[PDB]
């Protein structure tokens, strides 16, 4: 009547994605961790843009939309900042936000490519993905136009909006061989073998297994560039733990109150 002892094994560690395997755990925990990877992951992003002069051809809101989707590295800043909603001051304080500025005006004859590199941030570590591969194209200006603005970044998670969605695409998969029969293939011979399939090329699918629980969940968390993959996993685990702790505290208070 207690929990289990899951094991972890990394198969590929890079600066763009990680492929780990989790064994000896329930399917619900795996799916929940996945949904946390996508939704509930603190990360910094643009959420308040003050446009002062936009003579471009696009709409006034289009600039804000594109700026909202520009990732910002927050390897060690997201854990320090606090949610603007829970701030105890007025105006976007640097202790709970990061300021940006963009002032580009096409003067020469050739057309400009206003890229993310023009976002001059006040903080050193909170910068768009241009450290170490072109930059995110914002808009194109022509001789006579300009784009002056300054925006602030805040902490948020994907559940609020897609801008705070660090993971590009999580490849969640378990039981490569259709052993638990959770999916019935009308013609097994017509399907290809999974990447993690240990079955030989002769047999189509593993035989049935009545007394068999799902284990060995494979993951392929792919970072967009803002947070490192392993960092995404650690943040998700810590956040899920915090949610459970808060729920437990609330439950204890409710029981005590009754």
């Amino acid at each position: 009547p207690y929990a289990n002892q899951p094991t972890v094994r990394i198969t590929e560690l890079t600066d763009e994605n990680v492929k780990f395997i989790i064994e000896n755990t329930d399917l619900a925990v795996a799916n929940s961790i996945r949904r946390v990877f996508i939704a509930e992951v603190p990360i910094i992003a643009i959420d308040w843009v003050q446009i002062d002069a936009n003579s471009s051809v696009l709409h006034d809101e289009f600039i804000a939309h594109r700026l909202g989707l520009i990732p910002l590295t927050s390897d060690d800043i997201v854990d320090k900042l606090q949610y603007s909603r829970d701030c105890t001051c007025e105006e976007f304080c640097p202790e709970c936000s990061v300021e940006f500025t963009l002032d580009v005006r096409c003067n020469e004859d050739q057309t400009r490519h206003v890229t993310s590199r023009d976002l001059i941030s006040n903080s050193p570590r909170v910068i768009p993905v241009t450290s170490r591969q072109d930059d995110i194209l914002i808009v194109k200006l022509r001789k006579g136009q300009e784009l002056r603005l300054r925006a602030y970044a805040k902490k948020g998670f994907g559940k609020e909006h897609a801008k705070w969605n660090p993971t590009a695409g999580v490849a969640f998969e378990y039981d490569p061989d259709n052993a638990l029969r959770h999916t019935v293939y009308p013609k097994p011979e017509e399907w290809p073998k999974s990447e993690y399939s240990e079955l030989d090329e002769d047999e189509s699918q593993a035989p049935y297994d009545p007394n068999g629980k799902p284990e060995r969940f494979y993951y392929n968390v792919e970072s967009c560039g803002s947070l490192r993959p392993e960092t995404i996993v650690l943040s998700a685990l810590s956040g899920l733990k915090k949610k459970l702790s808060d729920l437990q505290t609330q439950l204890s208070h409710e029981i005590q109150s009754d």
Binding site: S55, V57, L58, R66, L69, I70, P71, T111, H113, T115, S116, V129, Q133, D134, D135, I136, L137, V139, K140, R142, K143, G144, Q145, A162, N165, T167, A168, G169, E222, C224, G225
Partner: protein
């Protein structure tokens, strides 16, 4: 009108690849090869470079001044 910043389905940044895609297509590479040369595995992110129409150019033709 302009290349999006991220793939609608997946979420991977694709905004910073339109210029690279055009350059690779211009040099010698074809589309089917350039897409995987840039690093686009999933087919959901490959439509952004194949389906996208670049209409910002026609818009820039109507320069306000000079």
């Amino acid at each position: 009108m302009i290349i999006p910043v991220r793939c609608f389905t997946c979420g991977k940044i694709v905004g910073n690849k339109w210029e690279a895609y055009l350059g690779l297509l211009q040099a010698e590479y074809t589309e089917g090869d350039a897409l995987d040369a840039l690093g686009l595995k999933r087919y959901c992110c490959r439509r952004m470079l194949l389906a996208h129409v670049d209409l910002i150019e026609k818009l820039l033709n109507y320069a306000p001044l000079e």
